[PDB]
Symmetry: D7
Subunit: 115 residues, 14 copies
């Protein structure tokens, strides 16, 4: 059901501010808030990132799975998807310049979100 699986462009990233610097880091993505007609988040299973770290930026980080907790940290909401940007093969932090998001169902590799 390919095309509507590409059609969930609305998204939100979770932030973390560091004082005594001037920048904000990403530590998670509250992904695909539940609209009226969207239940294709059952077929899609696995996620893969290619981000920009603080040291040696563009690199493959690895493939992990979704963790459906909530939307916007609110208890009375549906369960939406959430890409966790911590359980990944990294040591540094992640910044907000550019990023690529390769997504794995059974055998596609669709690029679903580009900043």
């Amino acid at each position: 059901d390919q095309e509507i699986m590409d059609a969930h462009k609305i998204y939100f990233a979770d932030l973390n501010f560091n004082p005594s610097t001037g920048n904000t880091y990403i530590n998670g993505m509250y992904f695909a808030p539940t609209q009226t007609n969207k239940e294709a988040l059952d077929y899609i299973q696995k996620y893969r990132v290619e981000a920009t770290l603080q040291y040696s930026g563009f690199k493959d980080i690895g493939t992990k799975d979704k963790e459906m907790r909530n939307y916007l940290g609110d208890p009375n909401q549906p369960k939406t998807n959430y890409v966790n940007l911590r359980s990944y093969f990294t040591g540094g932090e992640n910044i907000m310049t550019y990023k690529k998001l390769r997504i794995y169902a059974i055998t596609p590799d669709d690029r679903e979100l580009l900043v």
Copy 2:
């Protein structure tokens, strides 16, 4: 038992005040307080709102179900119905200008309350 199912005009909405603004938002409706002769709240099951958000106001929000907790937050009261204005497909807040309330039993779509 249609007509008395339309005859429960008494209602109350639950509020939330924001300081450093001047307005009050709605976050729930303590609906149909129990009068002497009203037990038609068993047949009615599902609810649907069409409200005015802070951004792109009039839109269909979706259909959800009742949560009979209490009336006016008081422990020694009967159980009345309560439309929860949080478990709905929204991201913003809701305001107090105008609203429409489409109600679903088995196959009617009766408009039960208009502000």
Copy 3:
């Protein structure tokens, strides 16, 4: 055993004081303290009030049941009857001007206490 069921004239009401007004509201009646010869409180079951609210005073409020907790809030006392003036079909508060108390055993409607 009708007449002694009418003969329990001693009673006490439970109060609630509001500051920044000048009046006191009723929120319960510790009813029929246990005297030496009174065990007719087993046959009587249900109670009904016709009180004076803060808005639209004299009206039928409804029929409810007894809740034998204690007398005067004291732990080492017998269990006496208690009319709860909260689990009743009302929204406002109750005041101390005038009141009527219609009491239901199997099929009498005896008026047991008049202020």
Copy 4:
């Protein structure tokens, strides 16, 4: 300026509730809240009560003076008069049945308030 000195009928009494009884006692009178045209509270000086105590009710209690603190215990209000019902020749408490209020300027004895 006699007649307007009689014309300040609006008043308020300060209460004290005792639990494990059913009554409320008077312990002060926030007297003559400041209206638009009333500055005759400068000429009047002394006050005298004839109240109903808990024991041997109607008796002369004595003559004392005013204590202009506030109105309704609120800091941002004008200063109004206040009859203190504690600095008086009594030992018991005062109740809310009936009372007489004899007021002393230079040589009148005007009865200013009757309950």
Copy 5:
């Protein structure tokens, strides 16, 4: 310097929310925030309200004076004017339906703000 003394239309009122009701009351007006070219708030001295109370709404309340504290309760701001809606000849509360605002310099009576 009459006309610019009429030209300060930007304003803000200070609110107070009561739970277990559904309304919000006014208890002050943070008046005339300091724009780039406005120093006519020195000539104007006294204020007078004609509001709508909870009981017997439209009435003259009286004339009082300004209290320059701050703007929006913030310490690092200029001093702006503030109409205090408490030091006025009233006993009840004030609501948000309609209001009239008669303002007194030396001898004008300009109506400066109408809701």
Copy 6:
């Protein structure tokens, strides 16, 4: 001593993070940290901003003065200059897109910093 008064390009802005949004606001500029050869911050006196607010972005905000507190909130540092982005003719917040900084000595209007 014009040119070195233009030559203090190193700067730092003070931030404020809002949760339940995704952005960071500016609320001050710790300006011109003290290098080895820079004592031209005595001649310069007044500052003027032209920023982008949350509503009606590009506008003249006004002219104010410096407040030499510290650098980076640290007690054992020299006193450097600080543009306060709060004591200015605004009501909303300020964001980080674009900004202009017009600076006033006796009679120049030098643009000292552009983002």
Copy 7:
């Protein structure tokens, strides 16, 4: 075993002091502390008081049973008898002027203690 059942004259009453009065009230009787030769407290079962209340003093109060807790509120003591002066058909308090103590075994009515 009648006579030694009368021979336990040593006793102690439990007190309660009220400030802002001058008197002390009785609220229990730690009865018959265990001497060397006294085990007749097994045959005796029920107790009855005729005391002096604060209002309408001498009256029959009723028959109740013993509650063997301790002696003098001390944990390392034997269990002695205790007449509870609270679980009795009264509303007021009890005072220390005069009292009568009618005691019920199977069919005697022995007066065991007189003050």
Copy 8:
């Protein structure tokens, strides 16, 4: 002015309760509450007791002076006299059986109060 100096029969003693005994001890006498016509407490100066201690009861204790603090420990009361039963030549405590009260003005020795 001898006779009215004898005519102040109203009095009150201050108590102290000891638990794990059954008695109450006297530790002060709030003496001569202020009635309407009594200002003979200026001429009288010194006091002397002959009480009953816990050991070797009836003995002369000594002569001391008055300490006008208040009446009944209440701040808004007049100043009345107070015999302090602690600053006296004793080591034990005082009990409530019998007492004699020898009072010294310039040269009388009037017995003013007998229990």
Copy 9:
């Protein structure tokens, strides 16, 4: 095994100090600390005291049993015997003048310790 059952002369008493007196009372006896060769504390079972109370000193108090808790209140010690001077037929306290200690095995009455 009589004689070594008499040969445990080492002992210790447990004290209790009262301030505002000058004396110390006995409230227990940590009896027979465990030496190298002493296991005759198994055959001996019951104890009896004849002490000096505060009132009517020398009297038989009664027979009770041992409570092997510890020695000197220390957790890492063996279990030694302990005569409890509280679970005995008394009402007052015990003092340190003179005492007699009659000890009961099956049928001896050996006096084991004399002060």
Copy 10:
């Protein structure tokens, strides 16, 4: 005035209890409580002890002076004398076996108290 200076036999010592021993030590003597006829404590000035320490008991300790604080640690008492058993040429503690008390006025050496 020699003989009455010898006639103040009533005295009291201040104690200190040590747990994990069995004894009580002396750390002060509240000396000569004020009786009715005793004001010879003005002429006497200096004190000298010959006590029994924990090590090398009977020895001259030295001469010191009185410290009139109170009697029995009570604030509402007269000032009586107090021999301080700490400001003396010792290192150990003092016990309660035997003691001698040599007292120095101008030139007598009267032994005033012997235990």
Copy 11:
């Protein structure tokens, strides 16, 4: 699978700072953070150190086993290996000068990390 078992050069040691000295001690090694292609940490089992202590530095310390807790003390990370530098036959502390790390699989003794 020998060579890639040698190819995990990335590592991290856990530190402990002592104030009132100038040095930092090692108390653990968070070993082999999980990269993309490394699952040879299953075959390797046992570890052995030859470190430099504070006293008699170079010595064999002994052979122990791995404790897979986390990486960098972070809960949302994979499980990596951890050499515990406490459960080893030592008494002193370990310093940061030089160290040797002999590692035991079934029968190799590969030196895996040298500082």
Copy 12:
């Protein structure tokens, strides 16, 4: 395996400092820390001390058993032996002058440690 059972000379004693004295007491011995080649602590079972107490120093104290808790109070250490110097037939404390340590396996009495 006698000789290596004698060869564990490394040891450590556990201390306890008393203020207001100048000495330190022994209250345990963390015995035989685990070296590389020592597992003879399984055959040895029982211990016996001959120490110097505060009173009547050199005496046989008795035979007790080992309590393998830890080494140096540290949780991540092996279990080593520990002679408890409290569960022994003593009443006083132990000091650090001289000591003898007689150790019991099945039938030897080897002296293992001498200070």
Copy 13:
């Protein structure tokens, strides 16, 4: 007095440990602890550093003055010199690799300490 002003080689640096890194930073130098014969710290006045920062390491930092507080943070010590490594023209932190220390009396530039 040049040469002994060079002869104070003993020194100490003050540290600061950062967790979640592996290094320690310098934030001060407790300089020249007071030996027996050293009072040349009066003539020397000013100090200058050339350190290695975290970014663009070797650079002139500037000239500042001494702050004689203490030695090793201890209150009962003499006053020694202290180079403050914070009041210097820097923004980053300082590390422990290499450093140069140029010292200014009236007109020498002696290098006093090299790591």
Copy 14:
């Protein structure tokens, strides 16, 4: 007055215990407690130590002065002398093996105490 200035052999040292070692360090000497006949501590002024440190033990430490605080840390004692073992030219700690104590009056160098 030389010889009695040598005759004050009684002394006491102040200790400091370190856990996780086995030793106690000296950090002060409460010197010459005040006996009956000793007031030669006025002529003596200065002190000098030659102790054994933790590193390079026997060395001259320097000359300092007395600090008369108290004896044994007790407030109600005379003022005795106190050698402070902290304000001395050292960096390490001091131990309890051997020590020499050279004392300076005007021109003697008497060795007053040897351990």
